[PDB]
């Protein structure tokens, strides 16, 4: 008979436990349409940092129609992935079972370190017997039989892809063992999927071959961790009055007399953050090329200044974006340096917002350390001019 308000938190994200993995993993793939061409559905990226952009909006009826807006964006570095294997799945009354794996003839050191805790001091025998066997005629026959089994019984075909940390030449991402994920091949018949996958073997796949610029994607990633947290932060319950004996930041009543136990719907202290999330409908604002190929990464048709996607001073705690990258509108779960998965969208992409063609007019590259007011180092140089240390440097130059 009391005053009413909704409960705190979403019981569908239970338990608030630490995620089993640090990598974002797709728990489902888009519905497979056999009418389309065979195509990959996912890609692993690394979060570098955030900035903001200006664009004009194409949305008739809106008060911002034909008007500039500024959008925060997230930059995710996407070095190409390497396809090392093919797996097939057959459907049974108890769910999908993998038929087998067709391994590539050659694997990178980075892929093989994933099988070790201490690679440098190990014997480094991973895949050696497999190489010596598959190379022969009995091995060729076994591979042919596995491929024929894929053709005969598989309804689902996925590729085994791994990341290239040597190409992701990042100093703070300490890991050197490649990240491995199964990427599902959608489109076409099963034979067509197998042909695409077999062509992909031992090859590099670039993020622009999986995703196009103005499309949207879903992001699988794990959120930033906070360790043990109380109910106020973890659940959003109210703080108690100042007058409260023995503590304020808690739930006053954790239950009625009956049931004579505590329900699972009551907010408790515990792990907060480090949870897996799937975060659909992130618009791709840009798929950039690596700076060693195209250094004018942040240049647009309206801002002719030559600049890269890296802000002055670098991304804080991350460094330089050296590879291909993806500009996503808004935010994604997880901190910088964390590997994440971009998945082709599962929700229907027919709204005006999701179909809108994105054209960037300005990309902010000012310092992310302390109220950056210069877009480029040349702008700062022309503000300040000759400083004392530059004069000393020239004085040394003349002698």
């Amino acid at each position: 008979c009391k005053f009413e308000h909704p409960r705190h938190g979403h019981l569908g994200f239970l338990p608030r436990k630490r995620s089993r993995q640090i990598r974002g993993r797709a728990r489902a793939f888009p519905k497979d349409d056999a009418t389309q061409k065979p195509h990959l559905t996912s890609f692993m990226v690394f979060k570098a940092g955030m900035t903001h952009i200006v664009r004009d909006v194409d949305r008739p009826g809106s008060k911002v129609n034909k008007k500039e807006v500024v959008e925060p964006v997230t930059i995710l570095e996407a070095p190409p992935m390497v396809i090392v294997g093919i797996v097939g799945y057959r459907q049974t009354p108890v769910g999908l079972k993998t038929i087998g794996t067709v391994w590539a003839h050659h694997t990178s050191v980075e892929f093989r370190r994933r099988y070790y805790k201490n690679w440098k001091q190990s014997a480094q025998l991973a895949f050696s017997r497999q190489k010596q066997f598959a190379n022969t005629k009995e091995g060729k026959v076994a591979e042919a039989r596995t491929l024929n089994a894929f053709a005969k019984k598989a309804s689902v075909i996925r590729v085994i892809a791994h990341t290239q940390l040597r190409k992701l030449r990042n100093h703070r991402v300490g890991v050197k063992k490649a990240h491995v994920q199964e990427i599902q091949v959608n489109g076409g018949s099963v034979a067509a999927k197998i042909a695409l996958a077999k062509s992909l073997l031992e090859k590099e796949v670039r993020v622009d071959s999986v995703f196009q610029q103005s499309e949207a994607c879903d992001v699988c990633s794990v959120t930033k961790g906070h360790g043990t947290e109380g109910v106020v932060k973890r659940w959003g319950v109210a703080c108690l009055p100042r007058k409260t004996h023995r503590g304020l930041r808690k739930v006053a009543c954790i239950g009625a007399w009956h049931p004579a136990r505590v329900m699972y719907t009551v907010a408790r202290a515990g792990q907060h953050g480090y949870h897996h999330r799937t975060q659909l409908n992130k618009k791709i604002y840009q798929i950039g090329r690596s700076v060693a190929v195209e250094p004018n990464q942040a240049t647009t048709t309206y801002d002719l200044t030559a600049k890269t996607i890296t802000p002055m001073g670098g991304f804080v705690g991350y460094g330089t974006v050296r590879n291909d990258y993806v500009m996503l509108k808004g935010s994604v779960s997880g901190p910088r340096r964390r590997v994440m998965t971009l998945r082709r969208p599962m929700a229907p992409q027919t709204s005006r917002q999701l179909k809108e063609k994105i054209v960037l007019k300005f990309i902010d590259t000012s310092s992310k350390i302390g109220h950056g007011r210069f877009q480029t180092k040349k702008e700062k140089n022309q503000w300040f001019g000759p400083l004392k240390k530059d004069r000393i440097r020239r004085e040394e130059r003349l002698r």
Binding site: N118, Q121, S122, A123, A292
Partner: protein
């Protein structure tokens, strides 16, 4: 380490042989790639040659693309029992947000740990000058940097270090040096 890499299990000879085998494998890869990249770059055109940036170790102020930096390190050998070096320690990076009444004793412990890791010594003695310098602005006013003189000596063989202050007017431009 694992059983197959333990010194007392393989012995000197086998440990050396396995080490040289790994090295010669890495070295064979490095030389093959060196020759291949040199000739592939040579027989390429100017548009492509400039398109390729510093692949074949062409660009200045770069690492050697072939190998690791530590593999290029010349291993002079055994350091002598008695050795002396002068080094700056960035104390403020170690003492940031530390309880004010603990700053100077913490600085003493951090200096002992720093030197002990540097010299493989657990007996690290603080000379009166260094303790006086660390404490000379009270318990919470430890200087952000200190230049210390480290003297290892011997007296099985027992190694210990004597750490003393080096008064400096400025810390700019000082790196780690060996003193005789």
């Amino acid at each position: 380490t694992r059983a197959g890499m333990k010194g007392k299990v393989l012995g000197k000879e086998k440990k050396a042989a396995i080490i040289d085998a790994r090295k010669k494998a890495a070295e064979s890869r490095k030389n093959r790639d060196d020759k291949r990249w040199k000739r592939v770059l040579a027989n390429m055109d100017e548009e492509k040659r400039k398109k390729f940036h510093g692949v074949g170790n062409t660009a200045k102020n770069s690492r050697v693309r072939g190998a690791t930096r530590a593999s290029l390190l010349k291993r002079t050998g055994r350091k002598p029992d008695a050795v002396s070096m002068e080094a700056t320690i960035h104390l403020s990076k170690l003492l940031k947000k530390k309880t004010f009444s603990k700053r100077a004793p913490l600085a003493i412990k951090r200096i002992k740990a720093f030197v002990g890791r540097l010299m493989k010594t657990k007996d690290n003695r603080i000379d009166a000058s260094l303790n006086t310098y660390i404490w000379h602005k009270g318990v919470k006013g430890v200087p952000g940097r200190v230049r210390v003189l480290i003297q290892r000596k011997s007296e099985h063989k027992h190694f210990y270090t004597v750490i003393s202050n080096v008064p400096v007017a400025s810390f700019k431009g000082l790196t780690t040096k060996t003193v005789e």
